Write a protein that binds this ligand. Structure first.
Ligand code: DGD
Ligand code: DGD
Ligand code: CLA
Ligand code: CLA
Ligand code: CLA
Ligand code: CLA
Ligand code: CLA
Ligand code: MGE
Ligand code: BCR
Ligand code: BCR
Ligand code: LMT
Ligand code: HTG
Ligand code: CL
Lengths: 28, 403, 339, 29, 62, 31, 63, 34, 28, 297, 27
């Protein structure tokens, strides 16, 4: 309802994608 | 002490007139430099394979020690790595006893040295105690320059690649003090065919130029002690105060632009047994290998005339015919490279060195994939640092001639 | 009750402005940027191009790309509910539908951003010259990413939303189109280079001919939409450049209309050139130069040297950049300079 | 060729000497 | 057999903290340590002893 | 080689320049 | 003001997406052992338009 | 290097110390008042 | 790990200058 | 008596064009390179840039136009040699070997350095700060790198940029096939600087034109900027400093490609467990570079 | 005829440069 979506639509897949990218270095 | 001014980037500019703290900062930076030299010598010694040449292993320091004839033999064969180990560990050690007063004078000592005496004190104006620290250093610049004269003539050093067979460490029994042969380098062209200063072929010329650089830096640094600045330092030449950093920032750059060109073209001060082949050297090595290969199986096809009538190589290496190397000076006849001498005089060391320089041409990328030669790492880095020290010169000379 | 409450809520003051244009901009812009990030993180290019172009396949920032669809798709929209993927998100990510997702969303997000510029200028009460200057990146996006594949075979010949895929696109236009020889391209280069040159000269001389250098520098009250244009002198800069270059501005209005004018025109002329290159109506050859090349075989300019380099780019990049054609070029038909 | 050589050498010394002379000497008046 | 270097390499790791916050802290502040405590001849003058114990490996390697 | 390609270059030079020249010498008479 | 409800559970949500092998199944990216088939050196490029989904799932039975 | 095979991974991470004095300076100026 | 006694916490530079970072604002 | 009439005529800022003491060198060198450029672009014999007898006809009277015409660089037989006219045997041997290119680029590089000096000279005479000089140093360093530094590193003046529209494209294509300039990051900073400079030019232009109402001069300059935007003064230093350091970077990028430390070849980054190589977008670029590199013999 | 069109357009450009620098419009 406020500008709190800026953290719920831009920080949540950012932290998810940095977790995916940090998992991606430990392959093979 | 931030006090006021220099918001967070010019924190070093806070020591412009703290002439006791600035001193310990200059001490700690010297300890940083000697620490880098000892640490990099140790790191290049730890990953070292003596049988392999040093330009296959990415070393820029160990070639600087191996040029001075410390632990090297005929053609580059290493014999004792303990000279490299002692010149690694003395640097580090001295970087600690030089780092100790980099925290004494810069943390624990006095803030200013203007309450001391005639010497050890200075204020950028009082240009009587300045021409004193200048001349004072000059006696150290001339004392250092001579140190290589002592290493060349009295301490068994100074490996030349222009020795008769292969290239050995050689004592320079007699340098060239001649003034026409000396300063006569300095009145050349900078362009192709004659290097401006980069064209030092002999070693006797490198020692004899250091004779004239030792007996002008000391003999001009006792001048700057006894004397005072003259009339032509205020009319056309200008004076300032915090512009001396700028003065030694602009001059530094032209030294980077010269040492870029030096390490790229010159084969004597930077010998090819430790630094690799140069630009012209690897391509002339390929042009000589593709002649001596096709002489055994299968003016000619490779030997063609230069635009001044010299028998040089042909193809794409016509541009590199001004190259002079120690594996080609037995082979080069009266009017340039003579073919007949390729059949007459051809030893079994001039083949191996030319093939090894042929397969090791300067190329490669920033992730070290090609290999990339150490002559191509010093040239690009000191070109970038020379242009950045020119850019810093226009800034620190632009904001100092306002006052 | 219905409409003016929503209109007064949207045009209200906030951290970000979200007008009537924000409802078109922010979902389309957010989904285009998010589709690019989830395509370069996870989505491969193996079934369309035959390449590995994601962080999941072990690529860096330079070699990731959300690649174009396959050539057998044609100019299909590739909807998720469409007849190609049929609701399958795996097959939609594999067939290249993320490219059409990002492209159509980038189109409607650019539409919403220029509507946002019109809306903010209609609020502040100014003339909307920023939305007229934003007509040039929109025309470049429409001519390159939309009109050029719609004039070609399919969506496969389009920029594939990466860094190295963009470099492949530049080499493709050099090899197959001779796009450097196009005069519309040359006006585009001249508009961009003159804009950067105008940018540097204007910044260099406002920062030099300031009214108060530092000595009696009474720091006056500065407003941001003047873009700091009170602080320098027009007469000193005109006196400098009339003696250095022999030509100089005497208007603060015509100078800034010139800075508006030069790279927008440059970018609009290169849009016209890429719209012509959509139909392969390129500026490849000079005909009398081809006749003079055929007359005597010892004639050589730099243009005839460039045509052999484009022939080399074409025949060596073609079996891998276009793998749906199944080019089997033997080593004997490949152009070499020693042949 | 030597008639074009010493002609060009005269002009280059004539201009660099005029540049050096006018830069230093003649700053007031 | 020169394991005294192995026991004395910790002696410089703990001398890279005394001349950090042992007498100078970070400015002109002798906080009860540089006034009459281990600075002058008591416990910070043995850096000469530590450069002697790092120069005592001159015949331990040669 | 175009014979009528030279006419295109002359019509591209002359026709907007005649418009600008007529516009300038017509605006200096009464602006 | 302060917000520490769940930051690092999203990091494990991102780690278990890749490490378990779920992202290869969700986004259709092939596994690094699963590019080619066991006998052929061919690239499975989609050659049709309305048979393209059946072409990709026809290729994925060769693995 | 020589017979100091104990401190060889000390040598492998030595020379980076220096340029990292720039990194220690940005934490010594942090929390002193910037 | 590369050792068990010779490859210890080697951030002595990031602790020693951090002593002159934290104990200088702990100082006056 | 007569010298002061000349020292007053040169140093005066009450002229139409400021001919300084740098202008004393700037005028005959930039006139000599201009007149030799117009002559060698209209009428010049063919030049062999290689050491073979197939020469490149670059001039207008030998069957070119404005797009394909060029002043061809010097021969491979000359290399880095100094080649004036008296060094040659005849005038035909000078014209056949690319001597006009060396003449034009040396006088141009000397006159552009004195153009930078003349900009600083007038600025100091007008009582201005020295920034203009600095900002002109970025295309000056970019022209020094493309005519001097890259020939020094490659060892021949044939590798310098030709003085024509199609010769620039040939230089760019041959440079990419040898060096892979597009993946070199100092070039990418140049593209970001030039793209951002055009962007900030159009954006800064549009934002001022829309916020400037009236401005007059008595002939005390007056301007009535329509202020007030919606929801220090260093916009012009950023406007100059973005495009400048961007062009500086790509100038020293090709100055480092002079010494063959070149680009980024991500050659076979991705692999398959069956000893199979999976291509990426780098292999297509490297596949094209092998196209243009092989055609350049 | 082909060359002299290019030289004529270039010479008119130089003549426009001369008329633009020295015969400029007064403020
Ligand atoms: C912004 C960027 C601005 C850049 C401005 C600065 C550019 C670089 C300045 C270089 C300074 C050093 C000049 C020099 O000593 O440069 C010397 C070099 C070296 O020239 C080469 O030198 C060769 C000599 O090799 C021989 O000589 C060596 C050294 O004597 C070896 O000992 C060995 O005998 C053998 O290899 C030949 O003489 C060739 O003619 C030639 O290719 O020349 C060259 O760089 C070419 C000429 C450069 C000067 C151009 C005018 C500058 C004003
Ligand atoms: C600027 C302002 C802001 C702009 C922002 C707008 C963004 C949204 C725009 C989206 C447009 C999508 C258009 C899709 C399309 O075009 O799709 C293209 C289709 C036609 O499809 C193409 O049709 C071609 C011709 O096919 C025909 O001919 C063949 C001959 O063998 C066969 O007979 C075949 O069966 C038959 O269909 C080929 O088949 C191509 O492969 C196929 O892709 O036209 C069509 O739908 C539409 C044709 C009319 C529209 C014209 C568009 C402008 C160009
Ligand atoms: C390695 C190079 C180097 C060295 C040896 C020094 C040394 C010094 N600096 Mg400068 N400094 C440098 C570069 C350097 N500096 C760098 C890279 C930064 C971070 C940007 C700083 C940030 C900085 C600031 C802001 C200040 C100092 C000051 C000091 C002195 C005291 C340091 C301190 O406050 O507690 C121990 C000391 C002489 C102070 C000074 O100028 O004294 C008057 C000061 O105010 N240092
Ligand atoms: C390279 C810079 C440098 C310079 C210019 C000097 C020179 C000086 N040192 Mg020496 N010093 C240096 C580096 C330097 N030192 C280093 C790195 C160390 C540590 C090994 C020392 C050891 C040292 C200490 C501990 C002290 C000095 C001090 C002095 C001053 C007086 C010494 C004297 O003449 O007494 C007469 C002796 C002779 C003439 C012999 C003068 C500043 C003192 C000072 O801080 O001055 C205020 C001081 O306390 N020196
Ligand atoms: C008058 C006696 C005297 C002399 C001859 C020197 C000369 C020296 N000083 Mg110290 N210095 C002194 C006292 C002296 N200083 C005085 C009175 C001042 C003015 C306050 C300084 C200011 C000063 C500073 C700020 C620095 C030096 C440095 C140096 C060294 C020169 C650079 C170098 O390492 O060359 C290389 C060595 C050779 C070529 C062979 C020897 C050398 C030890 C530098 C240094 O710390 O070097 C480690 C340095 O940063 N001098
Ligand atoms: C780092 C080296 C260095 C530095 C910074 C200086 C700096 C200076 N010199 Mg010295 N000089 C040096 C090395 C140096 N010199 C050496 C090695 C010699 C012996 C050849 C001289 C011989 C010399 C003479 C004969 C003269 C100077 C003069 C000067 C002054 C004006 C220089 C000028 O206008 O240049 C541009 C200036 C204080 C002039 C002066 O004022 O001396 C008192 C002067 O006449 N120098
Ligand atoms: C020939 C050797 C040499 C020379 C001439 C210099 C010269 C300089 N250094 Mg030093 N440095 C060196 C070797 C050298 N360095 C070595 C071997 C190290 C250890 C890795 C350092 C570590 C060092 C640090 C940590 C710092 C310096 C800084 C400086 C500058 C201090 C004066 C100033 O205010 O400039 C103002 C400078 C400008 C206005 C622009 C300079 C642009 C040049 C091209 C940047 C290169 C700086 C230097 C050569 C390398 C720094 C690397 C460092 C960050 C790790 C000056 C440019 C200080 C500085 O200000 O850095 C920018 C600084 O904080 N140096
Ligand atoms: C940034 C730091 C740069 C450092 C560079 C250092 C250079 C100084 C080293 C000593 C040089 C010797 C002096 C000349 C001797 C000579 O006479 O040079 C002659 C040509 O003149 C020359 O070469 C003049 C060089 C002109 C340079 C043109 C390029 C300018 C680029 C833009 C500059 C921007 C500011 C060539 O020699 C002669 O060449 C022929 C006649 O010209 C004959 O064969 C003669 O017998 C003789 O061999
Ligand atoms: C497609 C699609 C979609 C969408 C989705 C989305 C929208 C997503 C999003 C996503 C996102 C939104 C993501 C994000 C991401 C982020 C990231 C990925 C980031 C990263 C970062 C980084 C990596 C950092 C880096 C750095 C820098 C910058 C510099 C310094 C250093 C560092 C490292 C820090 C949907 C489902 C709807 C539908 C279907 C289709
Ligand atoms: C051969 C050789 C050698 C020998 C010898 C020598 C080398 C010597 C040196 C010499 C020298 C080293 C010289 C130098 C010089 C320098 C200079 C010269 C610089 C500077 C100057 C200036 C900078 C000036 C300035 C100015 C002017 C221009 C005018 C007025 C103003 C002013 C002042 C600013 C050597 C050793 C190397 C070794 C080997 C080789
Ligand atoms: C300071 C600058 C000095 C520059 C000097 C040159 C400036 C003027 C050059 C103008 C070009 C005229 O050059 C002249 O063009 C005609 C074409 O019309 C050429 O003629 C050439 O093409 C014509 C076609 O028209 C053929 O019939 C003819 O066989 C062929 O030689 C002449 O060979 C050339 O002498
Ligand atoms: C989309 C815009 C549709 C406006 S529609 C409009 O809205 C009014 C309320 O504001 C109603 O009272 C009115 O009856 C209705 O027709
Ligand atoms: Cl070759």
């Amino acid at each position: 309802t406020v500008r709190w979506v800026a953290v719920h639509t831009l920080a949540v897949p950012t932290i998810f994608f940095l977790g995916a990218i940090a998992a991606m270095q430990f392959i093979q | 002490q931030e006090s006021s001014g220099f918001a967070w980037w010019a924190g070093n500019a806070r020591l412009i007139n703290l002439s006791g703290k600035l001193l310990g900062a200059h001490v700690a930076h010297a300890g940083l430099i000697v620490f880098w030299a000892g640490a990099m010598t140790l790191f290049e010694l730890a990953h070292f394979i003596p049988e392999k040449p040093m330009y296959e292993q990415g070393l820029i320091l160990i070639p600087h020690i191996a040029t001075l004839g410390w632990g090297v033999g005929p053609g580059g064969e290493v014999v004792d790595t303990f000279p490299f180990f002692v010149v690694g560990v003395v640097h580090l050690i001295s970087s600690a006893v030089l780092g100790f007063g980099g925290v004494y004078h810069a943390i624990r000592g006095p803030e200013t040295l203007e309450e001391y005496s005639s010497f050890f004190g200075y204020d950028w104006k009082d240009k009587n105690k300045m021409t004193t620290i200048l001349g004072f250093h000059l006696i150290v610049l001339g004392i250092g320059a001579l140190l290589l004269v002592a290493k060349a003539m009295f301490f068994g050093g100074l490996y030349d690649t222009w020795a008769p067979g292969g290239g050995d460490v050689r004592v320079i029994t007699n340098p060239t003090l001649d003034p026409r042969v000396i300063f006569g380098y300095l009145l050349k062209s900078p362009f192709g065919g004659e290097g401006w200063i980069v064209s030092v072929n002999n070693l006797e010329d490198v020692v004899g130029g250091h004779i004239w650089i030792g007996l002008i830096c000391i003999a001009g640094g006792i001048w700057h002690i006894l004397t005072t600045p003259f009339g032509w330092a205020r009319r056309a030449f200008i004076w300032s105060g915090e512009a001396y950093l700028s003065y030694s920032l602009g001059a530094l750059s032209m030294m980077g632009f010269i040492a870029t060109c030096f390490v790229w073209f010159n084969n004597t001060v930077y010998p090819s047994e430790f630094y690799g082949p140069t630009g012209p050297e690897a391509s002339q090595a390929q042009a000589m290998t593709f002649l001596i290969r096709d002489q055994k199986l299968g003016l000619g096809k490779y030997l063609m005339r230069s635009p001044t009538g010299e028998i040089i190589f042909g193809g794409e290496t016509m541009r590199f015919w001004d190259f002079r190397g120690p594996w080609l000076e037995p082979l080069r006849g009266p009017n340039g490279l003579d073919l007949n001498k390729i059949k007459n005089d051809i030893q079994p060391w001039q083949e191996r060195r030319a093939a090894e320089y042929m397969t090791h041409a300067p190329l490669g990328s920033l992730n070290s994939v090609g290999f990339v030669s150490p002559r191509s790492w010093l040239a690009t880095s000191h070109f970038v640092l020379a242009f950045f020290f020119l850019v810093g010169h226009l800034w620190h000379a632009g904001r100092a001639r306002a006052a | 009750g219905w409409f003016d409450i929503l209109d007064d809520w949207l045009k209200r003051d906030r951290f970000v402005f979200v007008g009537w244009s924000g409802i078109l901009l922010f979902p389309c812009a957010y989904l285009a940027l998010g589709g690019w990030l989830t395509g370069t993180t996870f989505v491969t290019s193996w079934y369309t191009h035959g390449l590995a172009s994601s962080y999941l396949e072990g690529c860096n920032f330079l070699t990731v790309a959300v690649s174009t669809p396959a050539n057998s798709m044609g100019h299909s929209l590739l909807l998720l509910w469409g007849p190609e993927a049929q609701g399958d998100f795996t097959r939609w990510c594999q067939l290249g539908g993320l490219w059409t997702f990002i492209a159509l969303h980038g189109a409607f997000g650019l539409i919403g951003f220029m509507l946002r510029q019109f809306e903010i200028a209609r609020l502040v009460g100014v003339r909307p010259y920023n939305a007229i200057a934003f007509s040039a990146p929109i025309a470049v996006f429409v001519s390159v990413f939309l009109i050029y594949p719609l004039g070609q075979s399919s969506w496969f010949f389009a920029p594939s939303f990466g860094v190295a895929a963009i470099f492949r696109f530049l080499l493709f236009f050099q090899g197959f189109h001779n796009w450097t020889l196009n005069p519309f391209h040359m006006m585009g280069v001249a508009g961009v280079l003159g804009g950067a040159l105008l940018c540097a000269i204007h910044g260099a001389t406002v920062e030099n001919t300031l009214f108060q250098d530092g000595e009696g520098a009474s720091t006056f009250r500065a407003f941001n939409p003047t873009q700091a244009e009170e602080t320098y002198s027009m007469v000193t800069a005109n006196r400098f450049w009339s003696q250095i270059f022999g030509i100089a501005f005497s208007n603060k209005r015509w100078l800034h209309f010139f800075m508006l004018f030069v790279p927008v025109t440059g970018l609009w002329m290169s849009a016209i050139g890429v719209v012509g290159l959509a139909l392969n109506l390129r500026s490849y050859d000079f005909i009398s130069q081809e006749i003079r090349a055929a007359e005597d075989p010892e004639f050589e300019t730099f243009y005839t040297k460039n045509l052999l380099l484009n022939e080399g780019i074409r025949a060596w990049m073609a079996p891998q950049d276009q793998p749906h054609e199944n080019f089997v070029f033997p080593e004997e038909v490949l152009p070499r300079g020693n042949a | 060729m030597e008639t074009l050589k010493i002609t060009v050498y005269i002009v280059v010394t004539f201009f660099v000497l005029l540049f050096v002379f006018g830069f230093l000497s003649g700053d007031p008046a | 057999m020169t394991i005294l270097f192995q026991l004395a390499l910790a002696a410089l790791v703990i001398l890279s903290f005394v001349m950090v916050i042992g007498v100078p802290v970070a400015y002109a502040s002798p906080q009860d340590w540089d006034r009459s405590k281990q600075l002058i001849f008591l416990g910070s003058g043995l850096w000469i002893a530590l450069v002697l114990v790092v120069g005592v490996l001159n015949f331990f390697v040669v | 080689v175009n014979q009528l390609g030279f006419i295109a270059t002359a019509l591209f030079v002359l026709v907007p320049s005649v418009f600008l020249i007529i516009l300038y010498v017509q605006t200096e008479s009464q602006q | 003001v302060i917000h520490s409800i769940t930051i690092p559970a999203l990091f494990i949500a991102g780690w278990l997406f890749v490490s378990t092998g779920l992202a290869y199944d969700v986004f259709g990216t092939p596994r690094p052992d699963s590019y080619y088939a066991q006998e052929q050196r061919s690239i499975p490029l989609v050659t049709d338009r309305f048979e393209a989904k059946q072409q990709v799932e026809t290729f994925l039975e060769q693995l | 290097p020589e017979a100091y095979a104990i401190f060889d991974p000390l040598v492998d991470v030595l020379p980076v110390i220096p340029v990292l004095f720039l990194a220690l300076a940005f934490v010594w100026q942090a929390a002193v008042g910037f | 790990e590369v050792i068990a006694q010779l490859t210890m916490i080697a951030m002595i530079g990031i602790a020693g200058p951090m002593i002159i970072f934290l104990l200088a604002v702990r100082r006056g | 008596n007569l010298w002061e009439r000349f020292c007053n005529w040169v140093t005066s800022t009450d002229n139409r064009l400021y001919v300084g003491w740098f202008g004393v060198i700037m005028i005959p060198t930039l006139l000599a390179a201009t007149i030799c450029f117009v002559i060698a672009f209209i009428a010049a014999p063919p030049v062999d840039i290689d050491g073979i007898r197939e020469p490149v006809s670059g001039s207008l009277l030998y069957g070119n136009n404005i797009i394909t015409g060029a002043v061809v660089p010097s021969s491979n037989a000359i290399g880095l040699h100094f080649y004036p006219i008296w060094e040659a045997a005849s005038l035909d041997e000078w014209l056949y070997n690319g001597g006009p290119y060396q003449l034009i680029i040396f006088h141009f590089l000397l006159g552009a350095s004195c153009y930078m000096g003349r900009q600083w000279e007038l600025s100091y005479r007008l009582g201005m700060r020295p920034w203009i000089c600095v900002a002109y140093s970025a295309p000056l360093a970019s022209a020094f790198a493309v005519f001097l530094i890259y020939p020094i590193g490659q060892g021949s003046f044939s590798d310098g940029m030709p003085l024509g529209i199609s010769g620039t494209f040939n230089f760019m294509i041959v440079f990419q096939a040898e060096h892979n300039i597009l993946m070199h990051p100092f070039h990418q900073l140049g593209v970001a600087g030039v793209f951002g400079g055009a962007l900030f030019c159009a954006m800064h232009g549009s934002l001022v034109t829309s916020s400037l109402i009236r401005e007059t001069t008595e002939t005390n300059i007056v301007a009535a900027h329509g202020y007030f935007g919606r929801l220090s003064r260093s916009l012009h230093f950023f406007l100059a400093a973005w495009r400048v350091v961007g062009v500086w970077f790509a100038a020293l990028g090709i100055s480092t490609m002079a010494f063959n430390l070149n680009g980024f070849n991500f050659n076979h980054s991705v692999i398959d467990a069956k000893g199979n190589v999976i291509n990426t977008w780098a292999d297509i670029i490297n596949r094209a570079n092998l196209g243009m590199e092989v055609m350049h013999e | 005829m082909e060359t002299i069109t290019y030289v004529f357009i270039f010479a008119c450009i130089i003549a426009l440069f001369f008329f633009a620098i020295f015969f400029r419009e007064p403020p």
